Design an enzyme around this catalytic site. Sequence first.
Site, PDB file in Angstrom:
ATOM      1  N   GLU A  90      -4.229  -7.648   7.856  1.00  0.00           N
ATOM      2  CA  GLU A  90      -4.864  -8.712   7.028  1.00  0.00           C
ATOM      3  C   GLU A  90      -5.454  -8.114   5.747  1.00  0.00           C
ATOM      4  O   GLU A  90      -6.660  -8.207   5.486  1.00  0.00           O
ATOM      5  CB  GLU A  90      -5.913  -9.452   7.840  1.00  0.00           C
ATOM      6  N   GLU A 106       0.178 -11.033  15.372  1.00  0.00           N
ATOM      7  CA  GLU A 106      -1.160 -11.295  15.943  1.00  0.00           C
ATOM      8  C   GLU A 106      -1.457 -12.793  16.028  1.00  0.00           C
ATOM      9  O   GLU A 106      -1.273 -13.527  15.045  1.00  0.00           O
ATOM     10  CB  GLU A 106      -2.242 -10.630  15.106  1.00  0.00           C
ATOM     11  N   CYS A 147      -4.526 -15.319  18.435  1.00  0.00           N
ATOM     12  CA  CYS A 147      -5.470 -15.662  19.514  1.00  0.00           C
ATOM     13  C   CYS A 147      -6.150 -16.972  19.134  1.00  0.00           C
ATOM     14  O   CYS A 147      -6.215 -17.300  17.908  1.00  0.00           O
ATOM     15  CB  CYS A 147      -6.503 -14.566  19.755  1.00  0.00           C
ATOM     16  N   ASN A 198       8.019 -20.461  15.403  1.00  0.00           N
ATOM     17  CA  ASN A 198       8.410 -19.144  14.833  1.00  0.00           C
ATOM     18  C   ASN A 198       9.900 -18.875  15.093  1.00  0.00           C
ATOM     19  O   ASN A 198      10.619 -18.531  14.120  1.00  0.00           O
ATOM     20  CB  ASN A 198       7.522 -18.024  15.364  1.00  0.00           C
TER      21      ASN A 198
HETATM   22  O1  OD0 Z   1      -9.245  -8.305  13.993  1.00  0.00           O
HETATM   23  C1  OD0 Z   1      -8.646  -9.600  14.213  1.00  0.00           C
HETATM   24  C2  OD0 Z   1      -9.677 -10.559  14.771  1.00  0.00           C
HETATM   25  O2  OD0 Z   1     -10.246 -10.118  16.022  1.00  0.00           O
HETATM   26  C3  OD0 Z   1      -9.095 -11.925  14.961  1.00  0.00           C
HETATM   27  F1  OD0 Z   1     -10.153 -12.803  15.141  1.00  0.00           F
HETATM   28  C4  OD0 Z   1      -8.296 -12.384  13.780  1.00  0.00           C
HETATM   29  C5  OD0 Z   1      -7.836 -11.572  12.850  1.00  0.00           C
HETATM   30  C6  OD0 Z   1      -8.089 -10.093  12.874  1.00  0.00           C
HETATM   31  O3  OD0 Z   1      -6.912  -9.343  12.558  1.00  0.00           O
END
Ligand code: OD0
Lengths: 497, 497
Positions: free
Chosen positions: A235, A340, A342, A370
């Site tokens: 990021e 990534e 979550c 995706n």
């Molecule tokens: O480091 C992570 C973070 O824990 C997550 F909430 C979202 C983006 C970041 O890359």
Amino acid sequence: ARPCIPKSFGYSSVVCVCNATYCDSFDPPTFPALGTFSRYESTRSGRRMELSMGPIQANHTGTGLLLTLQPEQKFQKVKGFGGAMTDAAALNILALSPPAQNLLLKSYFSEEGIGYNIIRVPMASCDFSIRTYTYADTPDDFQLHNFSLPEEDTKLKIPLIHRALQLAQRPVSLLASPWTSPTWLKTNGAVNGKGSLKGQPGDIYHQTWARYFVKFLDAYAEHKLQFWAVTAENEPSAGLLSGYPFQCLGFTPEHQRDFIARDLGPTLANSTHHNVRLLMLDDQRLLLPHWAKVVLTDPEAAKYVHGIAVHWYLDFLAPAKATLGETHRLFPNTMLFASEACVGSKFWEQSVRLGSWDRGMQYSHSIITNLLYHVVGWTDWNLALNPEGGPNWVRNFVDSPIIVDITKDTFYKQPMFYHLGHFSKFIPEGSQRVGLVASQKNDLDAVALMHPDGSAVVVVLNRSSKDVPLTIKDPAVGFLETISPGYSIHTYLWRRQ
Amino acid sequence: ARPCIPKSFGYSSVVCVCNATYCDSFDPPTFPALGTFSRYESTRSGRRMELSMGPIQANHTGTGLLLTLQPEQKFQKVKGFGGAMTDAAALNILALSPPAQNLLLKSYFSEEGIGYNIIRVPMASCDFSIRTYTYADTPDDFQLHNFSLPEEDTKLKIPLIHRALQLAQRPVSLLASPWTSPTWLKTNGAVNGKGSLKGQPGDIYHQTWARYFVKFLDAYAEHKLQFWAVTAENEPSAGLLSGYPFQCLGFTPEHQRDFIARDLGPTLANSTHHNVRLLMLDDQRLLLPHWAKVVLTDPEAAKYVHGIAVHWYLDFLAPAKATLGETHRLFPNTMLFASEACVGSKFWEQSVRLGSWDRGMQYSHSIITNLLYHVVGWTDWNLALNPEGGPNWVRNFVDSPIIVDITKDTFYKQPMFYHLGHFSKFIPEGSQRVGLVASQKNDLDAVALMHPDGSAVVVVLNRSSKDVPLTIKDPAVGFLETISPGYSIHTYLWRRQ
Ligand SMILES: O[C@H]1[C@H](O)[C@@H](F)C=C[C@@H]1O
Ligand SMILES: *[C@@H]1O[C@H](CO)[C@@H](O[C@@H]2O[C@H](CO)[C@@H](O[C@@H]3O[C@H](CO)[C@@H](O)[C@H](O)[C@@H]3O)[C@H](O)[C@H]2NC(C)=O)[C@H](O)[C@H]1NC(C)=O
Ligand SMILES: *[C@@H]1O[C@H](CO)[C@@H](O[C@@H]2O[C@H](CO)[C@@H](O[C@@H]3O[C@H](CO)[C@@H](O)[C@H](O)[C@@H]3O)[C@H](O)[C@H]2NC(C)=O)[C@H](O)[C@H]1NC(C)=O
Ligand SMILES: *[C@@H]1O[C@H](CO)[C@@H](O[C@@H]2O[C@H](CO)[C@@H](O)[C@H](O)[C@H]2NC(C)=O)[C@H](O)[C@H]1NC(C)=O
Ligand SMILES: *[C@@H]1O[C@H](CO)[C@@H](O)[C@H](O)[C@H]1NC(C)=O
Ligand SMILES: *[C@@H]1O[C@H](CO)[C@@H](O)[C@H](O)[C@H]1NC(C)=O
Ligand SMILES: O[C@H]1[C@H](O)[C@@H](F)C=C[C@@H]1O
Ligand SMILES: O[C@H]1[C@H](O)[C@@H](F)C=C[C@@H]1O
Ligand SMILES: O[C@H]1[C@H](O)[C@@H](F)C=C[C@@H]1O
Ligand SMILES: [Ca+2]
Ligand code: NA
């Protein structure tokens, strides 16, 4: 096989309870006979990748929904699926008894589980750490004489990665990403906040930072681990933001372009790690296609960039067609990869919702979207968290497919585990997305792929409350008559020969 | 005229303290003669729009930074500057004794103040409300027989707007924006969360929602207020996000396109309010140019859209050239307007930092960047908040250029107030941005405009610690020899004939 032991925590579905002696598992994977299909079904009502079989029939009649396989119509080849071995994930996994640890690792990495073949590895500390550190904290060490892996790597992350690789049948690909450089390379002299590398690409600060990637890969190679790929920065846009609360390193797309062309690309290319792939962006997909245009129209950066890594956090702003779709159209030979995801990182999102079907459906909906727009893989964040969604040194608590309960030597497999597993288990590396045409408008999410060996896989997600009878046509093999129950996900597999 | 009473709260600069009997103010303009310039200076050290004058020289020699006006290079005409009359701002203003109230309103709206000429008015409740309500909460009232303004409008907002108008010597433009529709028009039956209008553009739900805009404008007209413009929805992308915590109404760009073409455009056009302007987007500038292409390439939507409103919250993601610049290139006759900004909405940001110079510089840097990429105006959020950054029913507390302390019948004018006043006071409606080039690379943010009366205005912001000696060349009058102190903002005025 061992079934899910369900437990409700008052959310929309159940978790599966595992401990030192018990975890739900599969029998060894096989295809049924030619003319028979396998169905794996998960439901909000509590089914968890339950196996059933049905006949493939020569004929079909009716006005109901038909999904026709286009086996001839070929799209992207899959790299794989997996999750992140953060400090927090390693601490949670190692807080379990050794036998509970092995059942957790087998759940993710074995054919008795869901067959993960990607591990994302942070390069030193992130928010999902209890200690703020880099590999080179000794000030102004431009020679990187004091570069070293601390115990977070040598005692926690590395031994767990070895154990995951020992449990896997398919080769596991490691992907490395840094959050922060040493603070003495940074404009702001801090791991967090608004801050970039000092100076400009091609200078001592940038050369040192590129050499740090080689030193990290050297250090993991001493522990007999090899990386598939690194990202240029986790990021990079985060380090452009006033007060950013945790480890970051700001790059504009121009800065990343020049860093890659002058420093990171050539340093990797002239190292023993020249085969390690470099992924750019590692950031929100709304940054596409702009970031791809800025980096990849410079031939000197473009020759070093294998792929574009994307994060899911602002996908609501970023329609797939205008971002992933347009990037593929412009740069079809540069793979797109989801690195990534979550739930729980938004201020209003509860960190952990034990048994959330909604969060499962968010995972499978994202993976399908995706895969329908050329993306070759999808990577979860923390492999395991505690019931708080930590540990995390800035209390940026989130959710994870597996929640460890150390007081009970127990771990909970949430709907997100099974939703990801419906892809990870049944879509091996090299699988190629193929067409799947609907006969009519419908509320389902679906994708079809062909295994390298020629077998078919179809994933069907129903995010509606309504049961949908449907037929799947394989033009060379026949028709699967089935249903997509409301709040279900199915994976269908069959031999074509 | 009447100077700042400074108070430090332990941040980087001072607030100016106002109460029932004392507030800082300006004297009327003296219009200095040809060959003299005016300089208004604010500094982190504590200067607050202090007036000085200097000579203009026929000649200049040196190797110092030269900024050259290009008065024949003409860009956008300015609409103006202002802030939002939310329920929270109205409650904060009315919490003061009446004398303190009029000194606050004079600070913003009078010529003894900073000459605001824009007020954004929420259409019913938002997060900066202490209760959730719409104008039509009677269920399934498709006729809108039970549409009505509550006391938040009739007792708080509308009387304060009338008072602002009377203090303003400049014509004031009102801008209306809705956060949510009645819940009985929404897919999710809630003021917040992921949810859109039911059905599809051109249907009963979309026709009722468009009629609600007309009923709103009719009700405000009963109270003797007329609008300049409405936006199609506040941050329409918010309603696309799972669990969105406060009032919202989700539209994709296609949904907004079809709503405008079929419902809102024709409904406003066939009303006594046909002269009221319609602004699209009202959302993060990263959505440009995509949203502009989706909406404005449909002739049936384009014929109703006056302009594009942008919010500043994700500007770090969205380079001005790739967003505002590209949108202007493609749609040069569709004005760009910044409709909302505040600091403190990010989870790590302290809500209120009394006397923050950093937040002041964030405002002026944003305004200068917007003006350099064709934007015709810039609108603050809450006109006033309490020291907690509220009130706010979801505790989404933020900062405001004026903070009210009810316990002390005192308000605090922050650096954000003065940084905005460097533009609002000196750049009236009809001002035109002109060219301004630099002789060398520099750390200054600068913009040049021509007042309707023909006079020059240049704003120079120095976000660096380093004093920068500077010359400004106007080919019509000659050379201004000046200095931009570290952590300063200056506005320069001069007659050109
Ligand atoms: O480091 C992570 C973070 O824990 C997550 F909430 C979202 C983006 C970041 O890359
Ligand atoms: C690890 O988890 C397993 C699975 O929950 C635990 O095993 C289970 O132990 C409970 C309590 O002894 C058993 O409950 C009982 O079921 C019988 C009928 O099957 C019923 O008549 C009893 O009233 C009671 O509800 C459960 O059967 C049993 N399950 C299995 C599959 O063995 C185990 O104890 C846990 N281990 C540790 C170390 O905590
Ligand atoms: C509203 O704010 C103004 C400005 O801060 C307050 O004025 C200040 O009031 C104090 C107390 O009266 C004044 O102090 C006095 O100064 C005289 C000399 O002129 C001295 O002999 C006394 O010993 C005392 O220090 C102060 O000068 C004055 N400042 C200004 C700029 O007028 C006012 O009191 C506030 N009113 C309320 C109701 O809060
Ligand atoms: C002040 O500026 C004027 C305006 O340019 C200068 O006058 C001219 O000088 C140039 C270059 O030497 C000549 O080519 C022009 O023909 C002159 N123009 C006029 C209208 O006279 C003047 O030399 C400068 N004065 C000083 C002291 O440097
Ligand atoms: C850094 O490395 C050098 C050379 O290996 C060593 O002598 C020195 O003591 C190290 N410094 C620290 C602070 O560990
Ligand atoms: C709604 O309006 C109608 C017509 O004016 C009226 O008869 C009715 O009482 C109103 N209902 C409510 C709940 O105010
Ligand atoms: O549980 C059912 C499933 O829902 C349906 F699709 C077909 C067979 C399974 O037994
Ligand atoms: O309602 C506002 C909110 O108060 C602010 F935090 C940002 C965006 C929204 O439009
Ligand atoms: O305070 C100074 C300013 O900094 C300089 F630019 C010129 C005049 C003023 O007195
Ligand atoms: Ca926002
Ligand atoms: Na913690």
